[PDB]
Design a protein around this motif. Sequence first.
Motif, PDB file in Angstrom:
ATOM      1  N   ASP A 108      -8.715  -0.463  -1.266  1.00  0.00           N
ATOM      2  CA  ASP A 108      -7.455   0.256  -1.408  1.00  0.00           C
ATOM      3  C   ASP A 108      -7.460   1.119  -2.666  1.00  0.00           C
ATOM      4  O   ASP A 108      -7.538   0.620  -3.790  1.00  0.00           O
ATOM      5  N   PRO A 109      -7.377   2.444  -2.476  1.00  0.00           N
ATOM      6  CA  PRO A 109      -7.372   3.404  -3.584  1.00  0.00           C
ATOM      7  C   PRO A 109      -6.084   3.341  -4.399  1.00  0.00           C
ATOM      8  O   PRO A 109      -6.117   3.310  -5.630  1.00  0.00           O
ATOM      9  N   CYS A 110      -4.951   3.322  -3.705  1.00  0.00           N
ATOM     10  CA  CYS A 110      -3.652   3.263  -4.365  1.00  0.00           C
ATOM     11  C   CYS A 110      -3.551   2.030  -5.259  1.00  0.00           C
ATOM     12  O   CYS A 110      -2.759   1.997  -6.202  1.00  0.00           O
ATOM     13  N   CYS A 170       0.827  -1.201   0.000  1.00  0.00           N
ATOM     14  CA  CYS A 170       0.000   0.000   0.000  1.00  0.00           C
ATOM     15  C   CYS A 170       0.865   1.257   0.000  1.00  0.00           C
ATOM     16  O   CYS A 170       1.697   1.452   0.887  1.00  0.00           O
ATOM     17  N   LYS A 171       0.664   2.107  -1.001  1.00  0.00           N
ATOM     18  CA  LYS A 171       1.423   3.346  -1.118  1.00  0.00           C
ATOM     19  C   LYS A 171       0.985   4.355  -0.061  1.00  0.00           C
ATOM     20  O   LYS A 171       1.815   4.961   0.617  1.00  0.00           O
ATOM     21  N   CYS A 172      -0.326   4.530   0.077  1.00  0.00           N
ATOM     22  CA  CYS A 172      -0.875   5.464   1.051  1.00  0.00           C
ATOM     23  C   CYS A 172      -0.045   5.464   2.332  1.00  0.00           C
ATOM     24  O   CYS A 172       0.599   4.476   2.684  1.00  0.00           O
TER      25      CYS A 172
END
Length: 97
Positions: free
Chosen positions: A75-77, A23-25
């Motif tokens: 998860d948006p990223c 996850c980037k966030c």
Amino acid sequence: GSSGSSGNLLDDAVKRISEDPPCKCPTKFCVERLSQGRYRVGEKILFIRMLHNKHVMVRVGGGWETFAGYLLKHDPCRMLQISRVDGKTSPSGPSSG
Ligand SMILES: [Zn+2]
């Protein structure tokens, strides 16, 4: 609570997938192990199973989907990557027991 068991296949896969892609966030997704085939995904409790220790699926309110697919949804990223989904069709109303 601590159980004390060797590296579980399901857990091993779930852990990886969840952390790959990572996850980037600035906030890692919510993933905690509760019991064999049980993990806290985000803000809900689902039953993640493994088909022939080759496929990773989860228990939803109307069938089963790919763990990696269910995560990307929230998860948006992750959504970034080429994905194709519809959503979730279920009558409001949580459960307890
Ligand atoms: Zn993210």
